[PDB]
């Protein structure tokens, strides 16, 4: 059964609620982004209206084979009417096609559902700035002060410089980047750009990337592995055994692998600066874990909420334990007392 925090009161609407069968009273199913924990349940047999971004709609049609007549893409930053209720989709600064949803209830209440997001000051100048929000359904993934990580720009700087140095020292080194979902495309695209190569990948991954409206993409990606010196592999293969095996398959073209695992947070963040990050090495293989996040750090989240000043917060992540829930509620109260709302 559908949990309360995926339901929008006063509407026929649910958010990211496709794994519960037919939800009683739901007239429209919203999907914030194309990640499996959120789309779980969608397929070509779905016959209710799905509301989403253009990019998410490309992925629904091409990857899950949802029929076109049930896909309802909306433009961002535009007031739209859905079953008699005004809604707006806003960029969530998560993965490609990921949105926040603003709902203007018939009784005058305004609700923001962040979906998954990485809070940014740029959000303080969207259509959020123009009215009060009463209720916030918040992505609380990293809602604790231990969760710090660097900007995406610093992380990409580190990766570009690391890769360019290694390959200039050894033109027979291969760079490998791990992936298991959409998101974090800048890692592998930035590295390929500094090295003057395309990124090589499976046909299934190339198909996924072709749904994303990224400019000039036919110029940056390929299925021809033999012509590429940046390869994408499943995240599960980014270990010494999986990489030794891959290196065999390249037929003596290469004699070294430098690999990258974009994680979210790991506890090496509580001690070490990005400048100071070192790989794990075995023989001719090195693996770097880089803290490239597409969710808010604690400080980013706090700033957003203290700016927005919602009347009520409903967490959507880490809700399954009493200790988590109690922790989060204590931070929410601190933020409110420090800011004065
Ligand atoms: Ni996500």
Short mmCIF file of C-alpha atoms and ligand atoms in Angstrom, two decimals:
data_model
loop_
_atom_site.label_atom_id
_atom_site.label_comp_id
_atom_site.label_asym_id
_atom_site.label_seq_id
_atom_site.Cartn_x
_atom_site.Cartn_y
_atom_site.Cartn_z
CA UNK A 1 0.00 0.00 0.00
CA UNK A 2 1.05 3.52 -0.88
CA UNK A 3 2.72 5.44 1.96
CA UNK A 4 1.22 8.80 3.01
CA UNK A 5 4.30 10.80 2.00
CA UNK A 6 3.73 9.90 -1.74
CA UNK A 7 0.21 11.33 -1.65
CA UNK A 8 -0.71 14.99 -2.36
CA UNK A 9 -3.78 15.95 -0.19
CA UNK A 10 -6.67 17.68 -1.88
CA UNK A 11 -5.86 16.20 -5.23
CA UNK A 12 -6.13 13.01 -7.20
CA UNK A 13 -2.32 12.91 -7.30
CA UNK A 14 0.58 10.64 -6.30
CA UNK A 15 4.39 11.11 -6.72
CA UNK A 16 6.78 8.30 -7.58
CA UNK A 17 4.13 5.66 -6.65
CA UNK A 18 4.11 2.99 -9.40
CA UNK A 19 4.79 -0.17 -7.24
CA UNK A 20 1.56 -0.31 -5.26
CA UNK A 21 -0.86 -1.36 -8.06
CA UNK A 22 -3.92 0.85 -8.67
CA UNK A 23 -3.87 3.52 -5.93
CA UNK A 24 -7.38 4.29 -4.70
CA UNK A 25 -8.49 7.71 -5.81
CA UNK A 26 -5.43 8.46 -7.97
CA UNK A 27 -6.32 10.22 -11.27
CA UNK A 28 -2.73 11.18 -12.29
CA UNK A 29 0.64 9.61 -11.43
CA UNK A 30 3.62 12.01 -11.39
CA UNK A 31 7.23 10.79 -11.91
CA UNK A 32 10.04 13.11 -10.74
CA UNK A 33 12.95 11.33 -12.52
CA UNK A 34 14.05 8.11 -14.18
CA UNK A 35 15.73 6.24 -11.26
CA UNK A 36 14.57 2.65 -10.44
CA UNK A 37 13.53 3.22 -6.79
CA UNK A 38 11.14 5.86 -8.17
CA UNK A 39 9.84 4.33 -11.44
CA UNK A 40 9.51 0.76 -9.92
CA UNK A 41 6.31 -0.71 -11.45
CA UNK A 42 6.09 1.11 -14.78
CA UNK A 43 6.08 -0.95 -18.09
CA UNK A 44 4.26 -1.11 -21.52
CA UNK A 45 1.07 -2.34 -19.73
CA UNK A 46 0.57 0.82 -17.66
CA UNK A 47 -2.67 2.59 -18.76
CA UNK A 48 -3.03 5.62 -16.43
CA UNK A 49 -1.77 9.11 -17.25
CA UNK A 50 1.90 9.74 -16.25
CA UNK A 51 3.04 13.31 -15.87
CA UNK A 52 6.80 14.10 -16.19
CA UNK A 53 9.53 16.08 -17.95
CA UNK A 54 10.28 15.70 -21.71
CA UNK A 55 13.49 13.80 -20.95
CA UNK A 56 11.82 11.44 -18.49
CA UNK A 57 9.09 10.85 -21.13
CA UNK A 58 11.80 9.87 -23.75
CA UNK A 59 13.15 7.26 -21.32
CA UNK A 60 9.63 5.89 -20.43
CA UNK A 61 8.83 5.39 -24.18
CA UNK A 62 12.22 4.00 -25.29
CA UNK A 63 13.50 2.08 -22.31
CA UNK A 64 10.38 0.78 -20.52
CA UNK A 65 8.15 0.83 -23.70
CA UNK A 66 5.35 2.81 -22.06
CA UNK A 67 2.84 3.70 -24.80
CA UNK A 68 2.86 7.22 -25.99
CA UNK A 69 -0.85 7.91 -25.39
CA UNK A 70 -0.29 7.64 -21.59
CA UNK A 71 2.87 9.85 -21.49
CA UNK A 72 2.20 13.48 -20.65
CA UNK A 73 5.43 15.56 -20.88
CA UNK A 74 5.38 19.10 -19.50
CA UNK A 75 7.73 22.02 -20.23
CA UNK A 76 9.74 23.34 -17.27
CA UNK A 77 9.16 26.70 -15.67
CA UNK A 78 5.62 26.94 -17.14
CA UNK A 79 2.24 27.12 -15.36
CA UNK A 80 0.20 24.08 -16.53
CA UNK A 81 -3.35 22.80 -15.58
CA UNK A 82 -3.63 19.06 -14.69
CA UNK A 83 -7.12 17.70 -13.84
CA UNK A 84 -8.14 21.15 -12.72
CA UNK A 85 -5.04 21.94 -10.61
CA UNK A 86 -2.20 24.33 -11.49
CA UNK A 87 1.27 22.76 -11.43
CA UNK A 88 4.81 23.81 -12.32
CA UNK A 89 7.90 21.63 -12.94
CA UNK A 90 11.27 23.07 -11.82
CA UNK A 91 14.82 21.79 -12.44
CA UNK A 92 15.91 19.62 -9.45
CA UNK A 93 19.74 19.72 -10.17
CA UNK A 94 19.75 15.84 -9.81
CA UNK A 95 20.15 13.64 -13.00
CA UNK A 96 18.96 14.60 -16.50
CA UNK A 97 15.19 15.17 -16.64
CA UNK A 98 14.79 15.35 -12.85
CA UNK A 99 12.18 17.84 -11.56
CA UNK A 100 10.68 19.37 -8.44
CA UNK A 101 6.83 19.82 -8.58
CA UNK A 102 4.88 22.87 -7.29
CA UNK A 103 1.15 22.22 -6.73
CA UNK A 104 -1.34 25.12 -6.21
CA UNK A 105 -4.25 23.46 -4.36
CA UNK A 106 -7.79 24.65 -5.01
CA UNK A 107 -8.16 25.78 -1.33
CA UNK A 108 -5.05 28.14 -1.55
CA UNK A 109 -2.38 25.84 -0.05
CA UNK A 110 0.89 25.64 -2.01
CA UNK A 111 3.01 22.41 -1.81
CA UNK A 112 6.61 21.85 -3.17
CA UNK A 113 7.73 18.20 -3.72
CA UNK A 114 11.50 18.26 -4.30
CA UNK A 115 11.73 14.76 -5.73
CA UNK A 116 15.49 13.94 -5.50
CA UNK A 117 17.50 17.24 -5.61
CA UNK A 118 20.82 18.98 -4.96
CA UNK A 119 19.80 22.31 -3.45
CA UNK A 120 21.46 25.35 -5.05
CA UNK A 121 21.23 29.16 -4.53
CA UNK A 122 20.09 29.42 -8.17
CA UNK A 123 16.78 27.94 -7.01
CA UNK A 124 16.12 31.06 -4.88
CA UNK A 125 15.51 32.84 -8.29
CA UNK A 126 13.13 30.46 -10.01
CA UNK A 127 9.25 30.72 -9.76
CA UNK A 128 9.70 29.70 -6.12
CA UNK A 129 10.58 33.26 -5.25
CA UNK A 130 7.07 34.56 -6.17
CA UNK A 131 4.91 32.95 -3.42
CA UNK A 132 4.64 31.31 -0.13
CA UNK A 133 4.94 27.46 0.28
CA UNK A 134 2.99 25.89 3.10
CA UNK A 135 4.19 22.23 2.86
CA UNK A 136 7.61 20.83 1.68
CA UNK A 137 8.08 17.14 0.76
CA UNK A 138 11.88 17.07 1.12
CA UNK A 139 14.74 14.85 -0.14
CA UNK A 140 16.47 14.25 3.20
CA UNK A 141 19.11 11.73 1.93
CA UNK A 142 22.04 13.48 3.65
CA UNK A 143 20.20 15.26 6.48
CA UNK A 144 23.02 15.15 9.12
CA UNK A 145 25.98 17.51 9.61
CA UNK A 146 28.61 14.81 8.97
CA UNK A 147 27.59 14.84 5.33
CA UNK A 148 29.92 17.32 3.67
CA UNK A 149 31.30 17.00 0.16
CA UNK A 150 32.91 19.38 -2.36
CA UNK A 151 31.20 21.23 -5.27
CA UNK A 152 30.67 19.22 -8.46
CA UNK A 153 33.04 21.70 -10.20
CA UNK A 154 35.99 20.88 -7.79
CA UNK A 155 35.37 17.12 -8.24
CA UNK A 156 35.38 17.42 -12.04
CA UNK A 157 38.60 19.54 -11.85
CA UNK A 158 40.26 16.73 -9.86
CA UNK A 159 39.13 14.04 -12.34
CA UNK A 160 40.20 15.96 -15.53
CA UNK A 161 43.65 16.77 -14.08
CA UNK A 162 44.17 13.17 -12.81
CA UNK A 163 43.20 11.59 -16.14
CA UNK A 164 45.13 14.07 -18.32
CA UNK A 165 48.30 13.61 -16.22
CA UNK A 166 48.11 9.77 -16.34
CA UNK A 167 47.53 9.47 -20.05
CA UNK A 168 50.16 12.12 -20.97
CA UNK A 169 52.70 10.12 -18.90
CA UNK A 170 51.50 6.83 -20.47
CA UNK A 171 49.67 7.06 -23.87
CA UNK A 172 48.90 3.34 -23.49
CA UNK A 173 46.74 3.83 -20.33
CA UNK A 174 42.92 3.26 -20.64
CA UNK A 175 40.50 5.29 -18.54
CA UNK A 176 37.40 3.46 -17.28
CA UNK A 177 34.35 5.04 -15.57
CA UNK A 178 31.65 3.10 -13.67
CA UNK A 179 27.87 3.69 -14.12
CA UNK A 180 24.53 1.97 -13.16
CA UNK A 181 21.88 4.59 -13.68
CA UNK A 182 21.51 7.95 -15.47
CA UNK A 183 23.20 10.90 -13.65
CA UNK A 184 26.85 12.04 -13.25
CA UNK A 185 27.44 12.12 -17.05
CA UNK A 186 29.82 15.10 -16.54
CA UNK A 187 32.45 12.76 -15.04
CA UNK A 188 33.02 10.72 -18.19
CA UNK A 189 32.19 13.53 -20.69
CA UNK A 190 34.73 15.96 -19.11
CA UNK A 191 37.48 13.31 -19.05
CA UNK A 192 36.86 12.33 -22.75
CA UNK A 193 36.90 16.05 -23.77
CA UNK A 194 40.39 16.66 -22.15
CA UNK A 195 41.78 13.53 -23.81
CA UNK A 196 40.27 14.29 -27.26
CA UNK A 197 38.41 10.96 -27.35
CA UNK A 198 34.76 9.77 -27.53
CA UNK A 199 33.34 7.73 -24.70
CA UNK A 200 32.83 4.05 -25.65
CA UNK A 201 30.00 2.02 -24.16
CA UNK A 202 27.43 -0.77 -24.67
CA UNK A 203 24.57 -0.42 -27.09
CA UNK A 204 22.07 -0.36 -24.14
CA UNK A 205 23.90 2.50 -22.45
CA UNK A 206 24.30 4.47 -25.75
CA UNK A 207 20.49 4.11 -26.25
CA UNK A 208 19.83 5.51 -22.75
CA UNK A 209 22.16 8.48 -23.40
CA UNK A 210 20.48 9.26 -26.79
CA UNK A 211 17.18 9.95 -24.86
CA UNK A 212 18.71 12.78 -22.81
CA UNK A 213 18.75 15.94 -25.05
CA UNK A 214 22.42 16.60 -24.26
CA UNK A 215 23.79 19.08 -26.95
CA UNK A 216 26.35 17.79 -29.43
CA UNK A 217 26.11 14.22 -27.98
CA UNK A 218 26.63 12.39 -31.30
CA UNK A 219 30.03 14.17 -31.06
CA UNK A 220 30.95 12.74 -27.56
CA UNK A 221 29.77 9.11 -27.31
CA UNK A 222 30.14 5.91 -29.40
CA UNK A 223 29.56 2.13 -29.43
CA UNK A 224 32.95 1.57 -31.14
CA UNK A 225 35.11 0.60 -28.16
CA UNK A 226 38.19 0.11 -30.36
CA UNK A 227 38.33 3.77 -31.29
CA UNK A 228 37.79 5.16 -27.75
CA UNK A 229 40.22 5.52 -24.81
CA UNK A 230 37.56 6.30 -22.20
CA UNK A 231 35.29 3.23 -21.60
CA UNK A 232 32.09 3.04 -19.50
CA UNK A 233 31.38 -0.21 -17.61
CA UNK A 234 28.75 -1.32 -15.10
CA UNK A 235 29.58 -0.11 -11.57
CA UNK A 236 29.84 -3.74 -10.41
CA UNK A 237 32.76 -4.40 -12.72
CA UNK A 238 34.87 -1.51 -11.12
CA UNK A 239 37.14 -3.77 -8.98
CA UNK A 240 40.55 -5.36 -9.63
CA UNK A 241 39.16 -8.68 -11.08
CA UNK A 242 36.62 -7.00 -13.35
CA UNK A 243 39.19 -4.51 -14.63
CA UNK A 244 41.97 -7.12 -15.27
CA UNK A 245 39.36 -9.01 -17.33
CA UNK A 246 38.43 -5.93 -19.33
CA UNK A 247 42.11 -5.13 -20.01
CA UNK A 248 42.53 -8.65 -21.49
CA UNK A 249 39.72 -7.94 -23.94
CA UNK A 250 41.46 -4.87 -25.39
CA UNK A 251 44.01 -7.05 -27.24
CA UNK A 252 47.27 -5.47 -26.08
CA UNK A 253 46.20 -1.93 -27.04
CA UNK A 254 46.66 -0.90 -23.40
CA UNK A 255 48.94 -1.80 -20.52
CA UNK A 256 47.42 0.19 -17.60
CA UNK A 257 43.90 1.12 -16.34
CA UNK A 258 42.99 4.23 -14.41
CA UNK A 259 39.36 3.81 -13.16
CA UNK A 260 36.81 6.13 -11.52
CA UNK A 261 33.85 5.22 -9.16
CA UNK A 262 31.63 8.25 -8.63
CA UNK A 263 30.09 7.50 -5.20
CA UNK A 264 27.83 9.89 -3.23
CA UNK A 265 29.32 10.30 0.30
CA UNK A 266 31.85 7.98 1.95
CA UNK A 267 33.46 8.64 5.51
CA UNK A 268 36.83 9.48 3.89
CA UNK A 269 34.89 12.90 3.51
CA UNK A 270 35.08 13.55 7.32
CA UNK A 271 38.93 13.65 7.20
CA UNK A 272 40.27 14.20 3.67
CA UNK A 273 40.05 17.15 1.16
CA UNK A 274 39.47 16.43 -2.57
CA UNK A 275 43.01 17.62 -3.34
CA UNK A 276 44.29 14.85 -1.01
CA UNK A 277 42.34 11.84 -2.55
CA UNK A 278 44.45 8.79 -3.46
CA UNK A 279 43.58 5.59 -5.36
CA UNK A 280 43.64 1.95 -4.44
CA UNK A 281 46.29 0.27 -6.59
CA UNK A 282 47.15 -3.31 -7.59
CA UNK A 283 49.79 -3.76 -10.22
CA UNK A 284 48.92 -1.78 -13.37
CA UNK A 285 45.35 -0.92 -12.12
CA UNK A 286 44.36 2.12 -9.98
CA UNK A 287 40.78 2.90 -8.72
CA UNK A 288 39.70 6.31 -7.50
CA UNK A 289 36.48 6.82 -5.46
CA UNK A 290 35.36 10.41 -6.11
CA UNK A 291 32.59 12.13 -4.04
CA UNK A 292 30.44 13.40 -6.90
CA UNK A 293 26.99 13.94 -5.36
CA UNK A 294 23.62 14.65 -6.99
CA UNK A 295 21.94 15.17 -3.59
CA UNK A 296 22.13 18.17 -1.23
CA UNK A 297 24.88 18.27 1.40
CA UNK A 298 23.61 19.12 4.93
CA UNK A 299 24.60 22.79 4.62
CA UNK A 300 22.98 23.15 1.13
CA UNK A 301 19.74 21.60 2.40
CA UNK A 302 19.65 23.79 5.50
CA UNK A 303 20.21 26.97 3.44
CA UNK A 304 17.35 26.07 1.05
CA UNK A 305 14.88 25.29 3.80
CA UNK A 306 15.80 28.42 5.90
CA UNK A 307 15.27 30.46 2.68
CA UNK A 308 11.94 28.84 1.79
CA UNK A 309 10.47 28.97 5.38
CA UNK A 310 7.85 26.23 4.93
CA UNK A 311 5.13 25.79 7.54
CA UNK A 312 5.42 21.98 7.56
CA UNK A 313 8.21 19.55 6.34
CA UNK A 314 7.51 15.95 5.29
CA UNK A 315 10.78 13.94 4.77
CA UNK A 316 10.75 11.45 1.84
CA UNK A 317 14.12 9.68 2.58
CA UNK A 318 15.37 7.85 5.74
CA UNK A 319 11.76 7.53 6.98
CA UNK A 320 11.93 3.83 8.00
CA UNK A 321 13.56 4.17 11.46
CA UNK A 322 12.50 6.05 14.61
CA UNK A 323 16.09 7.15 15.28
CA UNK A 324 16.32 8.69 11.74
CA UNK A 325 12.98 10.37 11.98
CA UNK A 326 13.78 11.84 15.46
CA UNK A 327 17.17 13.14 14.23
CA UNK A 328 15.64 14.86 11.19
CA UNK A 329 12.83 16.51 13.25
CA UNK A 330 15.44 17.88 15.67
CA UNK A 331 17.34 19.55 12.80
CA UNK A 332 14.15 20.95 11.33
CA UNK A 333 13.35 22.64 14.71
CA UNK A 334 16.89 24.01 15.05
CA UNK A 335 16.68 25.53 11.57
CA UNK A 336 13.35 27.16 12.32
CA UNK A 337 14.50 28.66 15.67
CA UNK A 338 17.80 29.92 14.26
CA UNK A 339 16.01 31.59 11.29
CA UNK A 340 12.89 32.80 13.18
CA UNK A 341 9.98 31.48 11.06
NI1 LIG B 1 17.45 9.65 -7.65
#
